Amino acid sequence: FEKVELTADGGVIKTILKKGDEGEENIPKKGNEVTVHYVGKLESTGKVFDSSFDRNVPFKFHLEQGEVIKGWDICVSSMRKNEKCLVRIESMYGYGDEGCGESIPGNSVLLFEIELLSFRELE
Ligand SMILES: CCc1ccccc1NC(=O)CSc1nc2cccnc2[nH]1
């Protein structure tokens, strides 16, 4: 239901599907080891290119430290533990004009579902 514009650019647009756990110790902070589950489809074809659920291996990364796509950094730094969102990430905040191999053509709108499982205070 809740539609959040995450960039003034409109590039990252998040829809909350399940409100996260309320409180402070539940919202992750910059540089923390984030653990997420996600599904990535291409807006064009609705084809899944990646599913952490389907591989049963959650994705861990350090928030806002440039490890993942910019759409992901922005998106994840706006979530609560146990939040599920939909994020429409525009190619600029994704893989840009190059794209990324076969799965993802140049200039591709990305649709993720992202669940924030947990986070440690790591590096
Ligand atoms: C190579 C992908 C990668 C490498 C290092 C760190 C993060 C990622 N993936 C993402 O940021 C977003 S998720 C994702 N991005 C992808 C691109 C192609 C195929 N599968 C993908 N899954």
- Quick one: which of 82, 87, 81, 32 has its CA closest to 61? 32
Rounded CA gap, 24 and 26, in Å?
5
Resolution of the structure in the document, Å: 2.8
CATH class for the region spanning 2-121: alpha beta
- The catalytic residue among 89, 93, 104, 112 is 112
Ligand 1 pocket by C-beta < 6 Å: which residues?
Answer: 40, 49-50, 67-69, 72, 100-101, 103-104
Method by which the model was determined: X-ray
Q: Is 50 helix (H, G, I), strand (E, B) or coil?
A: strand
8 Å CB contact between 62 and 76:
no
Say how far apart CA 55 and CA 53 lie, in whole Å. 5
Rg over alpha carbons for the chain, rounded to the nearest Å, is 14
* Start-to-end Cα distance in the chain: 34
In the chain, what are the domain boundaries?
A: 2-121
Q: 33, 41, 50: which to mutate for ligand 1, most atoms within 8 A of CB? A: 50
